[PDB]
Design a protein around this ligand. Structure first.
Ligand SMILES: NC(=O)c1ccc[n+]([C@@H]2O[C@H](COP(=O)([O-])OP(=O)(O)OC[C@H]3O[C@@H](n4cnc5c(N)ncnc54)[C@H](OP(=O)(O)O)[C@@H]3O)[C@@H](O)[C@H]2O)c1
Ligand SMILES: NC(=O)c1ccc[n+]([C@@H]2O[C@H](COP(=O)([O-])OP(=O)(O)OC[C@H]3O[C@@H](n4cnc5c(N)ncnc54)[C@H](OP(=O)(O)O)[C@@H]3O)[C@@H](O)[C@H]2O)c1
Lengths: 341, 341
C-alpha cells in the first residue's frame, strides 16, 4: 500500500542538485524540475544534478510551472531558489493551487508570520482551500531549532540562550552572498545592507524557537556587521574578487526579548572563508544548569538537504495550511521516502 | 481550573533532594516522601532537601508506603532509589496499585522490555488495570536518546552511531558505585562485575534509541572493564579510600546491531575522578554526512532531575501501562507543573 513520494524540484542550483540526487537515494522519484537559469533551462535534471544516466525530466522555466504541475501527479514541491517570502510566493502559489504540498529552504519561510504576515496569511488560506501544506525547513530546523529545544527539555530554568552559526558563503548561490553583502566596500555595505536591516535568518529562527518553547516575542534588535579578511578572496557565486578590507560577508547579531523574561541572543555569520576556516555551530543555555553544545565542523549543505527530505512524510501528514515546523515533532530519520498509494 | 501536580518522592537521597526543591520551583506540590535511611526516616522532606522552612511532609520508611499513598492523593511518584528492575519493582507495584503514575531514574527502567521482560510485563498489566503510567527517564532521555535522534533527523544515511558518556560516580549514591564495582580489587572485579556482565546503562539506552528510530535489535554485545587511577581516590557514597589499582569504577562498551544495518557503539564510563577530570558526552553519526556533537562538561545530576520534571505533563497524558519515553515526543521545557482541577 506504499509508493514513492513524487517530487518537483523548483530551483536546480547547488542545493537543488544535491536534493535531486539524494531524494532518489531514499526511494523518492523526481517528476518535474523548474529553473530559470539559462545554463539549466531545457537540460535533463539528472544531468544537471551530476547523475550519469538521464532521468527524462526536462528542466522548465518557471513561467511554465503550471504545465509541469498539471502533468506531474506530484506529492511535494521542494523549493530552493531565494531567501525572502516576496521572491518565494509565486512558486508557493503554484504548488498550493495544484494541491501539492511544498517545503522551501528559503530562510524567511522558516517562520514568516511577523516579517511577511500578509503573504503568509494569503498562502495559508490558499493551501487550506486546496488541502495541502506549505512549510519552511533546512539547516535551521535542527541547528537553530530542535537541537536547542531538545536540550531545553533537560533544563530546569532558562535565563538566556546564546547561539553561534557560521557557514561558508561559497557553498551556496548568489542570493545568499547578496543577502550577506559579500563583495561590498564598507560604505556600500552600511548604505545597502546595514541601513535596510533586513531580517537575518536568525531573526526568523529565533521567532521559531520562541514559538516552540511557548514564549511571546516582545522585541527583536538586530545589527548587521560586515566581515573582513587581510587578503583577497574570490566569490564563486558573484564571479568576482573581494579586496582586503571589503566585506567578505556579514555577522548578524539578533537579540530576541520575550514577555516571559528569557532572551535569545544569536550570532549568524555567512562569509567567504580564509584558508583553514570551517563552519561553526555552538549553543549555550544559561540558567539551571548551564549547558553548552558544539557541532564539530557541521556539513551545513548536506544537513540542510537531509533535513528537508526527512521532513517529507510529516509534511504529507500535516494539516492543510502554511504550517511552520515549530508545530511539528522533530524530523526523524527516514530510510525510504514513500507514502500511501 | 488547574492545580499543582501532586508528587510523592520515593528515595530522598542525592537526586531526590534536588527533585524536592526543583519540583516546587516549577509549581508542583510535595504530598509524600519515602526513604529507608536512618538519617531521613521521620525527618521533614523539605529540611532533608536543604530547604529552611519545614514542608510538614514527614519522610516514611518504605514498609509504610501504602499509608503515604492513601493520604497523599498523588498524581505522580518520582522513584530515585536503585538501578535495576528487581530493586524497583516493589515501589512501582505500590504506585500502580494506588493508580499513581510513576517515573523512575533507575537506569534499567529506561528500557527494560528485554533485560527484565517478566517484571516489565507484570508492571505494564498492573498499571493498565489501575489506569496509570510507569516509565523510566533521567540523563539518558536526551543525552543518550533524543539528542541523537534529533541529529539523525538531519542525516541522509546512518552507517554507525558512536557514543561516549562519562559521569562522576561520587555525584551519586551507593547503587551506582556498587553496579560499577567501585573499591573492588582487580581479581574480585573480574570474577563479579566482569563475569556476570549485567546490562550497563547504555545496553538499555541503545535499545531505546533503536525503538525510537524504528530499528529492530538483532544482537547486543557488551564488555565491562574496571577503571583505575595511579593514586588513592575517595568514594563518598561507599565511605572509603580506593587504593591505586583497585577498581575506581567501570567502563562498558556496548555494540548494538540492527536488522536494518546500522550499528550503535556506545562507551559508558562511571568512576571516581582524579583532579582535572570532567563529565564527557560526545556522539558521532557516521554516514552521509558525518556529524559529531559534544556537550562541554555536562551538568549530569541537574540535567537528570530537570528532564524528569519536564516529562511529568507527558506522563500524566500518556496511556496506562509501562510506556517507555521512546513512545513520547521529546521532553519540552515546562515552566509550570500543573494539571486539570
Ligand atoms: N535554509 C537553509 O538552511 C538554506 C541552506 C542553503 C541555501 N538556502 C537558500 O536557498 C536558496 C538556494 O540556495 P542555493 O545555494 O541552491 O542557490 P543557487 O545555486 O543559486 O540555486 C538556486 C537556483 O534557482 C534559480 N532560481 C532563482 N529564483 C528562481 C525562480 N523564481 N524560479 C526558478 N528558478 C529560480 C537560480 O537561477 P539564477 O542563479 O539564474 O537566479 C538557481 O539555478 C538561497 O536563497 C539560499 O540562501 C537555505
Ligand atoms: N537515569 C539517570 O540519569 C540517573 C542519574 C542519577 C542517578 N541515577 C540512579 O538513581 C538512583 C538514585 O541515585 P541517587 O544519586 O539519588 O542515590 P542515593 O543518594 O543513594 O539516593 C537513594 C535514596 O533512596 C534510599 N533507598 C534506597 N532504596 C530504597 C527503597 N527501596 N525504599 C526507600 N528508600 C530507599 C537510599 O537510602 P540508603 O543510602 O540507606 O540505601 C537513599 O536515601 C541510583 O540507582 C542511581 O544509579 C540515575
Amino acid at each position: 500500500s506504499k509508493r514513492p513520494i513524487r517530487i518537483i524540484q523548483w530551483g536546480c542550483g547547488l542545493m537543488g542538485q544535491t536534493l535531486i540526487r539524494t531524494l532518489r537515494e531514499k526511494g523518492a522519484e523526481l517528476v518535474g524540475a523548474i529553473d530559470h537559469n539559462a545554463a539549466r533551462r531545457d537540460r535533463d535534471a539528472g544531468e544537471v544534478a551530476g547523475l550519469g544516466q538521464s532521468l527524462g525530466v526536462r528542466i522548465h522555466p518557471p513561467d511554465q510551472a503550471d504545465a509541469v504541475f498539471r502533468e506531474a501527479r506530484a506529492d511535494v514541491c521542494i523549493l530552493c531558489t531565494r531567501s525572502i517570502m516576496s521572491e518565494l510566493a509565486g512558486a508557493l502559489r503554484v504548488a498550493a493551487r495544484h494541491g501539492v504540498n511544498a517545503i522551501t529552504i528559503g530562510e524567511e519561510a522558516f517562520y514568516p508570520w511577523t516579517t511577511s504576515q500578509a503573504l503568509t496569511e494569503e498562502l495559508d488560506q490558499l493551501a487550506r482551500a486546496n488541502d495541502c501544506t506549505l512549510t519552511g525547513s533546512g539547516f535551521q530546523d535542527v541547528f537553530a531549532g530542535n537541537l536547542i529545544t531538545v536540550l531545553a527539555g533537560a533544563t530546569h530554568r532558562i535565563d538566556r540562550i546564546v547561539g553561534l552559526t557560521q557557514y561558508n558563503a561559497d557553498d551556496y548561490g548568489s542570493a545568499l552572498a547578496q543577502k550577506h553583502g559579500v563583495g561590498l566596500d564598507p560604505e556600500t555595505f552600511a548604505a545597502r545592507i546595514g541601513a535596510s536591516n533586513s531580517p537575518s535568518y536568525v531573526w526568523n529562527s529565533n521567532e521559531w524557537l520562541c514559538a516552540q518553547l511557548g514564549w511571546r516575542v516582545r522585541d527583536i534588535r538586530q545589527q548587521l556587521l560586515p566581515t573582513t579578511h587581510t587578503g583577497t578572496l574570490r566569490s564563486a557565486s558573484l564571479g568576482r574578487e573581494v579586496p582586503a578590507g571589503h566585506a567578505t560577508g556579514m555577522k548578524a547579531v539578533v537579540v530576541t526579548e520575550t514577555h516571559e523574561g528569557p532572551v535569545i541572543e544569536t550570532h549568524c555569520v555567512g562569509k567567504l572563508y580564509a584558508p583553514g576556516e570551517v563552519d561553526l555551530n555552538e549553543w549555550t543555555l544559561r540558567g539551571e544548569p548551564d549547558t553548552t553544545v558544539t557541532i564539530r565542523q557541521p556539513a551545513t549543505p548536506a544537513l540542510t538537504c537531509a533535513t528537508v527530505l526527512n521532513r517529507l512524510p510529516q509534511l504529507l501528514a500535516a494539516p492543510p495550511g502554511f504550517v511552520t515546523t515549530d508545530r511539528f515533532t522533530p524530523a526523524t530519520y527516514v530510510s525510504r521516502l514513500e507514502t500511501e498509494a
